[PDB]
């Protein structure tokens, strides 16, 4: 079914303003004026921020502002504070068959700027793993801000989309700003590609860690 | 104020039936709509089903996916709603939240916006018990390739139920260590890992160990041996 | 011979008369041969066929060239073969079941007389027959000397819409030019078990389903007066307008009777239009043994009665009886003129043609009137009293026989027996709640096997909370004790272990 | 026999067969005589009698006791005496004049089969007939492979109402929950000469007649494009919503054709749902000689077609064809967990769910299907062309005669001849602007004479500012050149001096 | 801006037909409803009929009284409305006004309020056939019963068409005299009267005269003679 | 038919206020919000003062005020001026069947003081009329204040309501404040009653004019 398109992450600095987008379809956001926005703190209850395009509920201050035009809604957080750091979800009525629909949410983080570029470090499969009949390539992406990261695996210059995962931010301060990415293969699949790369994309730039070929091309 | 409290969560076998309760307070329950939502780990929110005000009609509405195996029910006499789940799949693992309509039940804008969300209750559906943790080393593949500092690691895989306890040099290291939050890899493999950073001079000449414990099984001790 | 003959060779061709005189008789022979064989217990109730099989078995495609008469006789025969016989004694799958001979003959006459009851000028006798029948029906309710307004309607759903339209128009005339947007919020009140057509009318007429309040029922399907009066108070306090209260006499599942006396005094108290939906309760109004059941009916403002459900009348015939004269004309006309006055010879009082939304009107009266001549009120009473005797008998058996549980409290209200049957294996499991899982599947399995065998057909349904239960109805005219006994045995014999 | 017998002793009783056979044959024998008499030119159509006298003459009173069968047979015979002879050739009073033999026989079978199209289980073949017939009608329109949605409706008025409801629900579905009050002002466009059904629909559906805007018509009778674009422009500027444009292919007053192709581009430009009313136009689609008039029909979104007027079918058969699949179920159905449950014996894709406001409807398709088999598309073409020929014959006469003035610009349409007739003595007077005074009375006086001698029946009406004119319509199959020549002569013979 | 001018009025015999025109200006006539009202002298306003906008309907509506004998018509090409009256009764005597709907044709509140009233045109319907003015004296029954002053009068009846011109003592008095408004008395008696006040002692010995003139006829002179 | 009930005449003095009532039924004034009030000055077209209970049209002074409650509407003239002296008509929508309905009308008079006592004079039948076989009794009511005046005829203490009319006021001279009332009888009907009276009721007091009985007790 339809899921509303929201950018995964957004950021700003204290006392500044920031605006978040929620782009739907003609069958949801474009079809109705019933667009809501929720705020979600980790492990807690969702809180209503905006209803009916631009209207607030009681006990939310007048620096949160809503608006929409055509197939796209916007939330604008003016006068940024430290505590405004949360997940922001948009939702729409979407007719009887689908009923409700939600977005993919946006993580707003308050500090901003490309403060620290990631340090990437790669680890190849152990002797114990190869004997077991498995191969795990592990990539560690250390100490970086903004929190948003897009990480990709390339074997001999080809992108690998199979047998991978990367772990999400948690409560701990040092594991909020670090990411681990694990690629799992079999030994006679791992042997076929000489060179393994772990490349990351972040607001500041791109940073790529690899192991160079052991034969001449 | 209005308060919604959800209960019934826990670890349950696949194919079984389970009842989640939501106990409301702060309003005259029988005249109000109640809606169920689900938050899946590391993904968005989804609507599960809705049961309406009995003044307006009261007939329950469900989502396509869960139709004919979930059932929403009420006891208006004790201000308490239920979600009954039948034939649970491992893909039904999520936090389930209870929610109240925002508007008063007579109102024109009723059944369009939901508020007063509870804490939600976690439902985990079993990936099946198996043998104790397997520990794997993550360390350099060739002699002295390091700069000013060297990083070692322990990778722990093939465990369930969760969690595991990780210790370095018998509790000596409370600094220079990073332990990552547990992740789930393909084929039902729960997976955790921890790194330790030390000076490059020490490597090979100083004994470093990772200690892993899992209480429903046995503890493991893994040594970082010479790269050469 | 009908190899050589086509429908263009029939009248009004100059050779047409003789083949026309033949063809109608040959068709009528096939109809008689179908009619007689229907009313036998040895003949199976149903034989089941999927869509696609029938479409490959027989050509149903429509023709470019004219097709000779023998093909047309085959098409008739083939259709009557595959079609389900709705006369059967052991057929309780639908509320409509059965077929009387005089109604049939009347509806045949109707289709030959071939005219439109929207004016007296082309439908002379039929307009008079409408008047006298509806006058007698209004008398029977309790309205003095048969005075009031009335319309023949094709079905109860359309009757509910007409009633709701009149109710609206009474409180606010403006809707015709202005539409719903102009007017105050119209609130309607109805029982929690009330039929879905009332909700459909609300959506259709632009009033919206939200503004039609369901008020809560007891164990028996009967609307709670206190919550009704309180919800009326709440509504009228908030600046909304209570216009319609739709109270039910004989609910279509449980056969339940709302408290008309209470609702009537509420209708006075807050000045509200009273709709009494007696569509599936109407039959009882004939009887003088049991009249106490309908206590309060005399003070109603609009009454829905279905003869096709309750007196066995061939399908399509619903009557909407309204207490005050003149309303329907005023409600539905979209000009002052309107071409039945003043040039035309006939009086306004009986025609009065432009009093409905539809711009032609079926002669639904003639079947009902000719049946009411041939059977009488005494026949309608006897029919009803016999059906109630079978329902009393049925309850007395099943309640005290092992493995039967009722969906509602006490005796059938009504002849509607809403029950659950418990297979032998299940019976020991007294334990709360878990037994629902098996129980919810029993009624499908039984219905499947019933339809396969073709032995007896009874309806099943779930209703809201209440998991899939059997709904035995006794509106069949060819029912007798032996079928009831057979069905009780058949349910047990099939529903095991 | 019948003097001591009652309805009670007939079928479904054990004794029933032999008396029931005899009784149904006796009833048919009266109908058979009525039919052959009714079609003859010597049989007088009506002797006119006031409502009160016709009642007082005979026992119409509703018996408490069962009346004896002898009387019931007499009541049939007496009714058939008094009732109109609607087979007649010189009878043009109504648009759906006359009766067809195979249609009559089919409508008897229809009623005898005695079931409704509520679900496939209770009406198997008939549901399959609806599919093929409506598919074939969509093919005849021009929609790919007969693709789209459709329902058989009890007359045009209800088709228009259903079409308007769909056209709304396609823009905003929220009417079902919240009603028309919770939506923007929905503006609808329609021709200046439009039929009253649209007004009735607009009132019923809560949108109001004021929200329906009337666009001006030219001398010939068709909706002017400039005014149409202007009203859409005005509405869409002023913050109102254009939702429906109703284009009239064959106006019921005059037979006039709005420009479908032209309007379709305007519909596309402003995103507006296109309703094509062909209720008095439908017949023309069959004739491959004349089809060019209806170019642009292939763009239309909802089409109202009446078979009963144009193909001869027994009365009140209207067909609503809708371009987009799935709309009708979602629009009209509450949810719904009884009819449309997924645990059925057949998969739910074949439904045929709750696609109208009315709950359940009779198997009216069979007559049209059997007629289409028997006559074919070629027979329908033949009929339509022969009517158009007769209109051109009639025209050539009245064109070249004094005291005959056509109401619309140029020659006949379609088969409508809309004329004024000027009596001899009136012909010689110059225009001094008040001549309407004499002219108005003519059509009433001629109508009285025509009916009192029973020699022919033609429809008369005034329309807006235009005084009383004759609307001669050829839809009768038994009409001939001789009857036209006779009609022209008869009008002079009565009108003089 | 909007101006309505009605014409066609006059004195008409009962049973005869008459056409009133209303010529509009300041608006685009074809898009607007037009309504006819009638004002009878000192009997208030009455509705006659209504014709709607051709964009919204366009068929005329009438009132009970005038139904099937009055006819309302339009010429949209020249911005001009008509009221045709056939078989006039004496009860149809009035000033007839033309009126424009207050609201625009698209508007929700259209066809419910009327404004922009014309000047109106008088229609008088009369079967009077009386010839010339009859003058009657109004003076005391016997001498010197009125105290300090006496009031004398001339009463003028039977005159048709309206009105008459009255002067006291050959036009010597336009001050101290009062001539009362003309009115219709029972059975076609159009009626006027004038008073003159004089001393009580002047009567008999001083002659007072009323002079009355009537344009389609001849002049009359009446003297007050001694009441012996 | 329904004709809305309005008081005949009402009055006030400059700078004060006056309120006019218009009482209908539950099916006209009580039933709809489409109630209008018009102002009519002699020799001029009617002018809309109030529509929809209390709304004024363009360029009508902001001191004419409209209001309603139940089956009765009100017009209220605050800050009364000289030019406010006119006829005031009320009208209501009456539903589709009757369409519109109107009131009797109310004459507002600006003075509000009973300045002078009316002078009433009665005249017996003319000698010329009596010879003709007619009898006309004339009653003249001079100089009455402030507004309207109500006159009635009594023969031997019995009311006579037949064969009478009174002359409607007009702007010219003192014809606003002077009224004539003519009663017409036949001689052998007029001779039957001994005494003829012309009695008037007015704002200031009461005034009765008569001719005493031929025979006295």
From Swiss-Prot, chains C, D:
Keyword Nucleotidyltransferase appears in the UniProt entry: no
Keywords for this protein: Cell membrane, Cell projection, Cytoplasm, Cytoplasmic vesicle, Decarboxylase, Golgi apparatus, Lipoprotein, Lyase, Membrane, Neurotransmitter biosynthesis, Palmitate, Phosphoprotein, Pyridoxal phosphate, Synapse
Reaction equations catalysed: L-glutamate + H(+) = 4-aminobutanoate + CO2
Cofactor: pyridoxal 5'-phosphate
Enzyme Commission number: 4.1.1.15
Post-translational modification note: Phosphorylated; which does not affect kinetic parameters or subcellular location.
Self-association and partners: Homodimer.
Family membership noted in the UniProt record: Belongs to the group II decarboxylase family.
Identification of the protein by name: Glutamate decarboxylase 2
The organism of origin for this protein: Homo sapiens (Human)
Origin organism lineage: Eukaryota, Metazoa, Chordata, Craniata, Vertebrata
Portion of the parent chain present: 88 to 584 of 585
């Amino acid at each position: 079914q339809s899921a509303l398109t929201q950018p995964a992450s957004a950021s700003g600095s204290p006392g500044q303003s920031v605006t978040i987008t929620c782009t739907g379809s003609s069958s949801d956001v474009g079809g109705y004026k019933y667009v809501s926005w929720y705020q979600h703190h980790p492990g807690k209850a969702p809180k209503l921020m905006i209803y009916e395009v631009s209207k607030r509920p009681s006990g939310v201050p007048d620096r949160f502002s809503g608006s929409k035009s055509g197939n796209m809604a916007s939330l604008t957080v003016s006068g940024l504070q430290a505590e405004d750091e949360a997940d922001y979800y948009c939702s729409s009525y979407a007719g009887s068959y689908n009923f409700y629909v939600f977005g993919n949410g946006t993580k707003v983080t308050v500090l901003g700027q490309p403060k620290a570029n990631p340090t990437v470090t790669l680890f190849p499969p152990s002797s114990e793993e190869l004997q077991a009949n498995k191969a795990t390539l592990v990539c560690l992406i250390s100490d970086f801000y903004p929190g948003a990261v897009t990480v990709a695996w390339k074997a001999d210059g080809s992108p690998v989309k199979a047998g991978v995962e990367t772990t999400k931010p948690s409560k701990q301060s040092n594991n909020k700003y670090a990411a681990s990415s694990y690629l799992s293969l079999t030994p006679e699949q791992w042997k076929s590609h000489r060179s393994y790369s772990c490349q990351v994309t972040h607001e500041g730039s791109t940073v790529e860690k690899t192991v160079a070929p052991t034969e001449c091309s | 104020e209005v308060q919604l409290v959800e209960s019934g969560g826990g670890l349950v076998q696949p194919g079984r039936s389970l009842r989640l309760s939501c106990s409301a307070s702060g309003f005259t329950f029988g005249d109000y709509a109640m809606s169920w939502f689900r938050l899946a780990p590391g993904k968005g929110l989804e609507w599960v089903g809705l049961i309406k005000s009995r003044a307006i009609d009261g007939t329950p509405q469900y989502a396509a996916s869960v139709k004919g195996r979930f059932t929403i029910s009420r006891d208006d006499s004790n201000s308490i709603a239920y979600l009954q789940m039948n034939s649970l799949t491992t893909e039904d693992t999520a936090i389930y939240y209870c929610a109240r309509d925002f508007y008063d039940f007579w109102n024109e804008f009723s059944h369009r916006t939901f508020d007063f969300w509870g804490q939600g209750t976690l439902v985990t559906v079993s990936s099946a018990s198996t043998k104790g943790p397997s520990v794997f080393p993550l360390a350099p593949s060739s002699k002295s390739t390091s700069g000013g500092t060297a990083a070692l690691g322990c990778l722990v895989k093939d465990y369930f139920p969760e969690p595991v306890t990780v210790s370095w040099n018998s509790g000596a290291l409370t600094s220079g260590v990073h332990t990552f939050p547990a992740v789930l890899q393909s084929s039902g493999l729960y997976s955790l890992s921890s790194v330790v950073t030390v000076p490059s001079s020490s490597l090979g000449t100083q004994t470093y160990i990772c200690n892993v414990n899992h209480k429903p099984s046995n503890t493991k001790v893994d040594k970082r041996v010479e790269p050469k | 011979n009908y190899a050589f003959l086509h429908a263009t060779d029939l009248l009004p061709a100059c050779d047409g008369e003789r083949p026309t005189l033949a063809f109608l008789q040959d068709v009528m022979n096939i109809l008689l041969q179908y009619v007689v064989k229907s009313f036998d217990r040895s003949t199976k109730v149903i034989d089941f066929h999927y869509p696609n099989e029938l479409l490959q078995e027989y050509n149903w495609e429509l023709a470019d060239q004219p097709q000779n008469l023998e093909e047309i006789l085959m098409h008739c025969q083939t259709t009557l073969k595959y079609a389900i016989k709705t006369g059967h004694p052991r057929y309780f799958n639908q509320l409509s079941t059965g077929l009387d001979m005089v109604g049939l003959a009347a509806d045949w006459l109707t289709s030959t007389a071939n005219t439109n009851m929207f004016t007296y000028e082309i439908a002379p006798v039929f307009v008079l027959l409408e008047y006298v029948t509806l006058k007698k029906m209004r008398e029977i309710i309790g309205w003095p000397g048969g005075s009031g307004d009335g319309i023949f309607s094709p079905g109860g759903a359309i009757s509910n819409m007409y009633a709701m339209m009149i109710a609206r128009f009474k409180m606010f005339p403006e809707v015709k030019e202005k539409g719903m947007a102009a007017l105050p919020r119209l609130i309607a009140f109805t029982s929690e078990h009330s039929h879905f057509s009332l909700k459909k009318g609300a959506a259709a007429l632009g009033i919206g389903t939200d503004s039609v309040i369901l008020i809560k029922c007891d164990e028996r399907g009967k609307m709670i007066p206190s919550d009704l009066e309180r919800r009326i108070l709440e509504a009228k306090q908030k600046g909304f307008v209570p216009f319609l209260v739709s109270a039910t006499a004989g609910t279509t599942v449980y056969g339940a009777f709302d408290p008309l006396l209470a609702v009537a005094d509420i209708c006075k108290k807050y000045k509200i239009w009273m709709h009494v939906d007696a569509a599936w309760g109407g039959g009882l109004l004939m009887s003088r043994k049991h009249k106490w059941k309908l206590s309060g009916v005399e003070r109603a403002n609009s009454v829905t009665w279905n003869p096709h459900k309750m007196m066995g009348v061939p399908l399509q015939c619903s009557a909407l009886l309204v207490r005050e004269e003149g309303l329907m004309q005023n409600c539905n006309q979209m000009h002052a003129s309107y071409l039945f006055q003043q040039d035309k010879h006939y009086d306004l009082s009986y025609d009065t043609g432009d009093k409905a939304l539809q711009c032609g009107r079926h002669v639904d009266v003639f079947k009902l009137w000719l049946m009411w001549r041939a059977k009488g009120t005494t026949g309608f009473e006897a029919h009803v009293d016999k059906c109630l005797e079978l329902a009393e008998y049925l309850y007395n058996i099943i309640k005290n026989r092992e493995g039967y549980e009722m969906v509602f409290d006490g005796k059938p209200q009504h002849t509607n027996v809403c029950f659950w049957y418990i297979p032998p294996s299940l019976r020991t499991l007294e334990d709360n709640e878990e037994r629902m899982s098996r129980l919810s599947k029993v009624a499908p399995v039984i219905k499947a096997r019933m339809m396969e065998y073709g032995t007896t057909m009874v309806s099943y349904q779930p209703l809201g909370d209440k998991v899939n239960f059997f709904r035995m109805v006794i509106s069949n005219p060819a029912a007798t004790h032996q079928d009831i006994d057979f069905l009780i045995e058949e349910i047990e014999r099939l529903g095991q272990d």
